[PDB]
Structure 1
């Protein structure tokens, strides 16, 4: 049976395809598809981005490294990598040591 780790990897890919298949090339994200994905799937991790079209505009341009106005899977995974690392760092910030009790924030 698929492990928690394998399920998580598959779900990341499935989520990308849920938005990439809507219009244009079915394996790339148009601006509209990327914004939809960010607002629906990263509304907590990218809370300031969902309500701010401005930062989404910067991020699309940063990720679109071949300047073809769509995000390939490989281009979009640069964002996933940044999010994973940021979440790891924030998880540690929210779980300080030495309090003799647990914390439950996770990452934000």
Structure 2
């Protein structure tokens, strides 16, 4: 049976593929594909990015390290890593200790 740790790893690759096969090379993200994925799959984690196209342009040029105007699976995971670490930090920030009660914000 697939554990929830296994589904999360699969869903990440499944979601990258859902946007990489749309145009151009089927295993890389064009600008249109990456903006489409970001606006549709990272709308809460990147609430300021979806509406501010000026930010997606900065992110695309930082992730595209080999400067071929598309994001390989390796280049796109660099963002997924930064999100996981940032979500882990915020999750500890939204859950302070010593209050004597739970918090249910998660990360944003």
TM-score range with shorter-chain normalisation? over 0.9
Shift of 1:81: 0.2
Q: What is the TM-score normalised by the length of structure 2? A: 1.00
**Off by >4 Å, runs of 4+ in structure 1:** none
Q: What is the TM-score normalised by the length of structure 1? A: 1.00
- Unpaired segments of 5 or more residues in structure 1? none
Shift of 1:41: 0.2
Q: How many residues align?
A: 108
Question: CA RMSD for the aligned pairs?
Answer: 0.2
* Residue deviations 1:13-70 (CA, integer Å, cap 9, x gap): 0000000000000000000000000000000000000000000000000000000000
- Unpaired segments of 5 or more residues in structure 2? none
Shift of 1:75: 0.1
